[PDB]
UniProtKB/TrEMBL annotation:
It is found in: Secreted. This is Interferon d. Disulfide bonds join 2-93. GO terms for molecular function: cytokine activity; cytokine receptor binding.
Length: 150
């Protein structure tokens, strides 16, 4: 049982989703259900490890050029800051020392959003709207995984 899961995660999720909604008002690759299915029936620690990776992968997409996105930069800054806070918060639910592997298939999936949506579509406003929709789904499914541990 973790301060962050019990007192902070829901409020950060709601804020992160409000910011994506603000982004969406200015306007693919199969959702990785098999990876979420495995996380769903995994240990609490393995569910947290998975969820931290989802959040950090989602934040890492905004290292890509989003100059052509329909959003304000301040909104992107606020959204990535909240996601970064959420990741750090869930990381705090386990010990600082460990050996767990990064999920390779999840990493490959986020690389395929980078290559097959953003890079193929030259980082267009339309490409970023597709990424926004997928990120929102990740955040909703992440909130489901965390809520199972309350």
């Amino acid at each position: 049982s973790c301060r962050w899961v019990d007192h902070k995660f829901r409020q950060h999720s709601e804020t992160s989703l409000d910011l994506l909604n603000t982004m969406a008002n200015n306007s693919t690759v199969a959702f990785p259900n098999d990876l979420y299915s495995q996380a769903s029936k995994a240990s609490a620690e393995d569910k947290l490890h998975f969820t931290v990776q989802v959040l950090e992968e989602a934040a890492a997409l905004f290292e890509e050029d989003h100059s052509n996105a329909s959003w304000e930069e301040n909104t992107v800054e606020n959204f990535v800051n909240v996601v970064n806070q959420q990741a750090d918060g869930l990381r705090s639910c386990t010990g600082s020392h460990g050996h767990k592997k990064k999920n390779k298939k999840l990493h490959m999936y986020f690389k395929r959003l980078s290559s097959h949506v953003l890079k193929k579509m030259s980082h267009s406003a339309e490409a970023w709207e597709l990424i926004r929709k997928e990120i929102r789904t990740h955040l909703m499914r992440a909130d489901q995984l965390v809520s199972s541990l309350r």
